[PDB]
Scaffold this active site. Sequence first.
Site, PDB file in Angstrom:
ATOM      1  N   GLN A  99      -3.497   3.591  18.812  1.00 49.18           N
ATOM      2  CA  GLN A  99      -4.537   3.321  17.837  1.00 49.18           C
ATOM      3  C   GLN A  99      -5.388   2.154  18.324  1.00 49.18           C
ATOM      4  O   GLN A  99      -4.845   1.076  18.633  1.00 49.18           O
ATOM      5  CB  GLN A  99      -3.957   3.047  16.446  1.00 49.18           C
ATOM      6  CG  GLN A  99      -3.298   4.284  15.849  1.00 49.18           C
ATOM      7  CD  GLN A  99      -3.018   4.166  14.367  1.00 49.18           C
ATOM      8  OE1 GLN A  99      -2.722   5.159  13.703  1.00 49.18           O
ATOM      9  NE2 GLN A  99      -3.112   2.953  13.838  1.00 49.18           N
ATOM     10  N   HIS A 146      -6.700   6.097  10.678  1.00 51.12           N
ATOM     11  CA  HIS A 146      -5.625   5.401   9.970  1.00 51.12           C
ATOM     12  C   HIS A 146      -6.222   4.599   8.820  1.00 51.12           C
ATOM     13  O   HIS A 146      -6.516   3.412   8.950  1.00 51.12           O
ATOM     14  CB  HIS A 146      -4.839   4.512  10.926  1.00 51.12           C
ATOM     15  CG  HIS A 146      -3.616   3.912  10.311  1.00 51.12           C
ATOM     16  ND1 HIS A 146      -2.806   3.020  10.979  1.00 51.12           N
ATOM     17  CD2 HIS A 146      -3.054   4.092   9.092  1.00 51.12           C
ATOM     18  CE1 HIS A 146      -1.804   2.669  10.195  1.00 51.12           C
ATOM     19  NE2 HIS A 146      -1.931   3.304   9.044  1.00 51.12           N
ATOM     20  N   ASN A 195       0.812  -1.209   0.000  1.00 55.11           N
ATOM     21  CA  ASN A 195       0.000   0.000   0.000  1.00 55.11           C
ATOM     22  C   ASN A 195       0.849   1.265   0.000  1.00 55.11           C
ATOM     23  O   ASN A 195       0.343   2.339   0.348  1.00 55.11           O
ATOM     24  CB  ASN A 195      -0.976   0.002   1.192  1.00 55.11           C
ATOM     25  CG  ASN A 195      -0.274  -0.070   2.536  1.00 55.11           C
ATOM     26  OD1 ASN A 195       0.929   0.164   2.642  1.00 55.11           O
ATOM     27  ND2 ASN A 195      -1.031  -0.405   3.577  1.00 55.11           N
ATOM     28  N   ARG A 217       4.023   7.200  11.054  1.00 53.41           N
ATOM     29  CA  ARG A 217       3.534   6.694  12.330  1.00 53.41           C
ATOM     30  C   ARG A 217       3.388   7.874  13.277  1.00 53.41           C
ATOM     31  O   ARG A 217       4.191   8.810  13.232  1.00 53.41           O
ATOM     32  CB  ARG A 217       4.466   5.633  12.940  1.00 53.41           C
ATOM     33  CG  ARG A 217       4.440   4.275  12.240  1.00 53.41           C
ATOM     34  CD  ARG A 217       3.059   3.623  12.322  1.00 53.41           C
ATOM     35  NE  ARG A 217       3.068   2.227  11.880  1.00 53.41           N
ATOM     36  CZ  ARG A 217       2.556   1.793  10.728  1.00 53.41           C
ATOM     37  NH1 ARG A 217       1.996   2.641   9.881  1.00 53.41           N
ATOM     38  NH2 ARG A 217       2.608   0.502  10.416  1.00 53.41           N
TER      39      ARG A 217
HETATM   40  N1  LIG Z   1      -1.633   3.499   6.162  1.00 48.44           N
HETATM   41  C1  LIG Z   1      -0.463   4.282   6.311  1.00 48.44           C
HETATM   42  O1  LIG Z   1      -0.540   5.442   6.639  1.00 48.44           O
HETATM   43  C2  LIG Z   1       0.884   3.628   6.031  1.00 48.44           C
HETATM   44  C3  LIG Z   1       0.957   2.614   5.129  1.00 48.44           C
HETATM   45  C4  LIG Z   1       2.153   2.022   4.854  1.00 48.44           C
HETATM   46  C5  LIG Z   1       3.288   2.445   5.514  1.00 48.44           C
HETATM   47  N2  LIG Z   1       3.214   3.463   6.434  1.00 48.44           N
HETATM   48  C6  LIG Z   1       4.454   3.910   7.159  1.00 48.44           C
HETATM   49  O2  LIG Z   1       5.295   4.409   6.344  1.00 48.44           O
HETATM   50  C7  LIG Z   1       6.699   3.655   6.598  1.00 48.44           C
HETATM   51  C8  LIG Z   1       7.462   3.615   5.328  1.00 48.44           C
HETATM   52  O3  LIG Z   1       6.682   2.945   4.321  1.00 48.44           O
HETATM   53  P1  LIG Z   1       7.525   2.478   2.984  1.00 48.44           P
HETATM   54  O4  LIG Z   1       6.683   1.682   2.042  1.00 48.44           O
HETATM   55  O5  LIG Z   1       8.091   3.685   2.288  1.00 48.44           O
HETATM   56  O6  LIG Z   1       8.749   1.498   3.562  1.00 48.44           O
HETATM   57  P2  LIG Z   1      10.307   1.533   2.947  1.00 48.44           P
HETATM   58  O7  LIG Z   1      10.252   1.180   1.461  1.00 48.44           O
HETATM   59  O8  LIG Z   1      11.187   0.586   3.752  1.00 48.44           O
HETATM   60  O9  LIG Z   1      10.893   3.062   3.077  1.00 48.44           O
HETATM   61  C9  LIG Z   1      11.340   3.386   4.340  1.00 48.44           C
HETATM   62  C10 LIG Z   1      12.579   4.294   4.146  1.00 48.44           C
HETATM   63  O10 LIG Z   1      12.783   5.004   5.501  1.00 48.44           O
HETATM   64  C11 LIG Z   1      14.269   5.285   5.387  1.00 48.44           C
HETATM   65  N3  LIG Z   1      14.733   5.827   6.735  1.00 48.44           N
HETATM   66  C12 LIG Z   1      14.824   4.729   7.509  1.00 48.44           C
HETATM   67  N4  LIG Z   1      15.232   5.179   8.735  1.00 48.44           N
HETATM   68  C13 LIG Z   1      15.363   6.526   8.675  1.00 48.44           C
HETATM   69  C14 LIG Z   1      15.733   7.519   9.562  1.00 48.44           C
HETATM   70  N5  LIG Z   1      16.094   7.104  10.942  1.00 48.44           N
HETATM   71  N6  LIG Z   1      15.755   8.793   9.167  1.00 48.44           N
HETATM   72  C15 LIG Z   1      15.414   9.144   7.880  1.00 48.44           C
HETATM   73  N7  LIG Z   1      15.058   8.191   7.012  1.00 48.44           N
HETATM   74  C16 LIG Z   1      15.038   6.908   7.426  1.00 48.44           C
HETATM   75  C17 LIG Z   1      14.820   4.245   4.897  1.00 48.44           C
HETATM   76  O11 LIG Z   1      15.875   4.684   3.975  1.00 48.44           O
HETATM   77  P3  LIG Z   1      17.396   5.021   4.524  1.00 48.44           P
HETATM   78  O12 LIG Z   1      18.051   3.720   4.927  1.00 48.44           O
HETATM   79  O13 LIG Z   1      18.191   5.659   3.423  1.00 48.44           O
HETATM   80  O14 LIG Z   1      17.341   5.962   5.710  1.00 48.44           O
HETATM   81  C18 LIG Z   1      13.625   3.607   3.949  1.00 48.44           C
HETATM   82  O15 LIG Z   1      14.020   3.736   2.529  1.00 48.44           O
HETATM   83  C19 LIG Z   1       6.374   2.434   6.978  1.00 48.44           C
HETATM   84  O16 LIG Z   1       7.445   1.822   7.838  1.00 48.44           O
HETATM   85  C20 LIG Z   1       5.129   2.635   7.791  1.00 48.44           C
HETATM   86  O17 LIG Z   1       5.450   2.886   9.108  1.00 48.44           O
HETATM   87  C21 LIG Z   1       2.036   4.052   6.702  1.00 48.44           C
END
Ligand SMILES: NC(=O)c1ccc[n+]([C@@H]2O[C@H](COP(=O)([O-])OP(=O)(O)OC[C@H]3O[C@@H](n4cnc5c(N)ncnc54)[C@H](OP(=O)(O)O)[C@@H]3O)[C@@H](O)[C@H]2O)c1
Lengths: 383, 383
Positions: free
Chosen positions: B313, B332, B146, B284
């Site tokens: 939540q 959410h 998603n 989050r």
């Molecule tokens: N319904 C919703 O609202 C919803 C849905 C899905 C996900 N989410 C949230 O969004 C998060 C990310 O989703 P995603 O699909 O993009 O996962 P993702 O593909 O793993 O992207 C996460 C990125 O965060 C980076 N990052 C990690 N730690 C960091 C830090 N300490 N400071 C700055 N950047 C950092 C990482 O890259 P680097 O290693 O280069 O830092 C990673 O590329 C999820 O973990 C989830 O919590 C919310």
Amino acid sequence: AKILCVLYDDPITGYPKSYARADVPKIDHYPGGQTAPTPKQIDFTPGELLGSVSGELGLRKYLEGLGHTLVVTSDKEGEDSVFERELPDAEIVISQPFWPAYLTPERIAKAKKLKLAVTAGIGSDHVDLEAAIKNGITVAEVTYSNSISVSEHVVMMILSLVRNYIPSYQWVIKGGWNIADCVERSYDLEAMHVGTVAAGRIGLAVLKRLKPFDVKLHYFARHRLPESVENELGLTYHPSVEDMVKVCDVVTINAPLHPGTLDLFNDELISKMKRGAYLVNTARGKICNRDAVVRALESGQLAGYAGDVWFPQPAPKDHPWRTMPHHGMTPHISGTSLSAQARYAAGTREILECWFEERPIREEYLIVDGGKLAGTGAHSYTV
Amino acid sequence: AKILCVLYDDPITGYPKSYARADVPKIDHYPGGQTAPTPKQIDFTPGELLGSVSGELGLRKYLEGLGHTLVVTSDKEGEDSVFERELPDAEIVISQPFWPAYLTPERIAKAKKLKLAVTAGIGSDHVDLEAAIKNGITVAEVTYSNSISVSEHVVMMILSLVRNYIPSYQWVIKGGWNIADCVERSYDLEAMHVGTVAAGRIGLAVLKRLKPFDVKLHYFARHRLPESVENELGLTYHPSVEDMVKVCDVVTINAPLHPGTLDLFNDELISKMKRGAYLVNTARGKICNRDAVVRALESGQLAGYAGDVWFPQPAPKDHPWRTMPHHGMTPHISGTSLSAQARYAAGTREILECWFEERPIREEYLIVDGGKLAGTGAHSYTV
Ligand SMILES: NC(=O)c1ccc[n+]([C@@H]2O[C@H](COP(=O)([O-])OP(=O)(O)OC[C@H]3O[C@@H](n4cnc5c(N)ncnc54)[C@H](OP(=O)(O)O)[C@@H]3O)[C@@H](O)[C@H]2O)c1
Ligand SMILES: NC(=O)c1ccc[n+]([C@@H]2O[C@H](COP(=O)([O-])OP(=O)(O)OC[C@H]3O[C@@H](n4cnc5c(N)ncnc54)[C@H](OP(=O)(O)O)[C@@H]3O)[C@@H](O)[C@H]2O)c1
């Protein structure tokens, strides 16, 4: 000379003393090359409220410094209004589509000295162009000044309808959570078919903004776009509007209002759309038949309708679009964001400096000149 | 052979008997190449409500055919709930971030038979990864399922905050017009500075969708995107989040919740943002300090805040994010649109099919495996 300028009212909490931000981005040109308005100077800071009565489009110091008189008012309906009382003496009339001083043939008849009618904004359908042609009245608008602003409003409204934003926000205000209630009508936009009625300054800007959403793009227009542009964006053309709305999940209307588009979206064309289609209309209210939209939302033929344009304007307190189901309406605000106001207020002044210096008004600002549809009017308008 | 599944309640108006539209588009792969979930079959039609108790993520027929038992409930808070009562017996636990069954250390110690924890969605911060590491519990989630849905939600909320969408809609419902009340806080997004915290699957899709709005794009991440990608999108890289937020009109948070991001947007970091900045958080809730957001809005340091994620939540009725000024929250929901559900339900089945047939779970689905961070968990989280 006398300049008659109709603006909407100040906020009910008074003319703003402060703004949320310190400035607005400076915009020098528009996509496709047209430059930002070029007044000799401006008597405002971009970002301030210019479209309300106390803003005066920043014109008072300039116009009075040339010895003319400037009457700014919001009171625009009835023989008794400031507008109609001062009209027979005005050489120049200025108003905005958001709070428009309708220049019907009766008012143009009473307007003995009216030579120049300026739309502070885009879309001069509130002027009777036929009657303007019969009286040697130059009609001009600040072309492109808020076309980009509307395209943002369009994409925002498409997403809100498809993802079911506003009802979900209401669950937050209600103190609930209710995920299943929010998302039983919540979809992604990705890979949907989205089509636009017209591909002009707004419609093209909409198409560009939608492209990275990975939607499948469609459009309908009198003239076809260049085949390169179709290819860089992935467009499918339809010489018939009925053809487009039959394959489209989402439809945006971005055409001007004139006989060719008036009531274009009646019960009959809407009934040709896919069941549960989303209809967005930031163009003009009358292009959609008012009761047809209401009916099609009640039956689930439209899954949503959103826009900022109504008929008439203001809309009365009982206007049925306010209470029809599954809508995401605003009042007429998209073209009068503070960013857009800085542009069309500067353009209004540019037109005025050209008029009083006997220089041509920019060919692209012109809608009617010398008893003809001219300029942009020749290319976008019908009478 | 017991599967414990926590899902949110059916709609209060009942489990839906119809939907606003006939189908949803077929999503085939994700940008960058990852394939859509590949369960051997699925027991639903893409578009049905799968994340509620009656939806069961479409897993009952499958799991009961293999002689396993599937226990589904929404009751999840505390020692005294169906979830914690059924926990000591479950080999597999599944929940979604939207209505999350917190697998705290205390509960993991009690979950005497638990070997797999599946996130039906993305983000497994509701599972205490460290405790799952010590107890040898595999943690998986349907990566990318998603991410695109969230990037749409983000651009929707950026536009709504900046253009002042929701208060303007309210004026429609209250029977008003009030142009200057709507637009005294209404701006265009065009040419503003927008930055994302992280540029992973969501953040990159956010950046691609923002590019045609002609914004100036910024990003902070622990590691840089490729030069080719930076150049094509116009990105500016910042080595620290402080460096980014000081020039940004709008900031999006798209990083996971882990020790490197917990409480990142606290009073100190927020006071380093531009006066009147907009902050959007679909990542989050805990990445933003709860009361620091409120104080910054009450003072105007932030012109607006929007997001769909909260702590805890569900959020209780008196949660201050509901009533703070200038917000555009939803519950959410962005990751549980009907389109997104079909994908992570498919992926949940895929992870379960691999588990029961002793085949490896996809490397990109893995968060914790074999007693340490594994797969994507090694790439995106810490502990
Ligand atoms: N319904 C919703 O609202 C919803 C849905 C899905 C996900 N989410 C949230 O969004 C998060 C990310 O989703 P995603 O699909 O993009 O996962 P993702 O593909 O793993 O992207 C996460 C990125 O965060 C980076 N990052 C990690 N730690 C960091 C830090 N300490 N400071 C700055 N950047 C950092 C990482 O890259 P680097 O290693 O280069 O830092 C990673 O590329 C999820 O973990 C989830 O919590 C919310
Ligand atoms: N605040 C607001 O909501 C707001 C702000 C600005 C403008 N507007 C409305 O939006 C209208 C368009 O804005 P714009 O900046 O894009 O002006 P524009 O640059 O002239 O684009 C209008 C396009 O409509 C096309 N079209 C004209 N007549 C048509 C017809 N009968 N059927 C199908 N297509 C037709 C025209 O192209 P073809 O000749 O190729 O068909 C034209 O390219 C404005 O006239 C105004 O009414 C609303």
